[PDB]
Amino acid sequence: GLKLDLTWFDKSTEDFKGEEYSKDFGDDGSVMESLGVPFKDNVNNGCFDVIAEWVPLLQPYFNHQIDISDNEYFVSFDYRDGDW
Amino acid sequence: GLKLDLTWFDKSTEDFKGEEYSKDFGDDGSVMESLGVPFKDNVNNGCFDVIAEWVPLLQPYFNHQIDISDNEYFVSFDYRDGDW
Ligand SMILES: [Zn+2]
Numbered sequence: 548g549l550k551l552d553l554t555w556f557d558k559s560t561e562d563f564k565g566e567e568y569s570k571d572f573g574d575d576g577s578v579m580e581s582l583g584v585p586f587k588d589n590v591n592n593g594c595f596d597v598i599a600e601w602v603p604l605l606q607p608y609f610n611h612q613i614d615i616s617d618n619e620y621f622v623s624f625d626y627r628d629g630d631w
Numbered sequence: 632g633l634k635l636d637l638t639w640f641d642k643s644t645e646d647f648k649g650e651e652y653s654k655d656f657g658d659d660g661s662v663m664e665s666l667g668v669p670f671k672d673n674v675n676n677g678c679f680d681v682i683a684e685w686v687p688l689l690q691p692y693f694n695h696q697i698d699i700s701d702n703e704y705f706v707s708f709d710y711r712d713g714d715w
Pocket residue numbers: 593594623676677678707
């Protein structure tokens with residue numbers, strides 16, 4: 548089902564540094580609703596800049612330690628048939 | 632260097648169909664310039680919708696036969712240090 552695709556870039560050199568997917572949330576788009584982004588209309592449809600208020604809400608799903616002072620972050624909401 | 636990330640979905644069902652990276656162009660941003668998308672000033676941003684005019688400009692770098700009448704395409708301009 549739904550997975551969050553997080554990518555980060557260095558603010559200085561601005562090169563693509565890393566990427567990490569969240570666990571599969573299945574058909575529940577609550578995580579997106581909690582971010583203020585409608586589910587059905589925004590999946591597989593572009594990237595969103597990660598703002599400060601999003602950091603703590605997203606952190607529990609990633610091993611990468613999100614630091615918006617050093618990196619620029621983008622999140623895209625990908626959806627595919629269960630079990631990736 | 633620069634690599635173009637092409638992802639496409641079925642235009643009817645809306646299901647993911649495939650994804651393919653182009654070769655590494657190094658610091659040659661000519662392909663982006665031909666699309667009318669400033670090289671340095673547009674890498675590592677969101678993704679763009681591929682319009683018909685872009686098809687012949689991109690086709691030489693992908694094995695997949697680009698067909699917009701059947702699929703919907705997105706392209707991202709990813710830039711990382713060399714040797715990826
Ligand atoms: Zn994107």
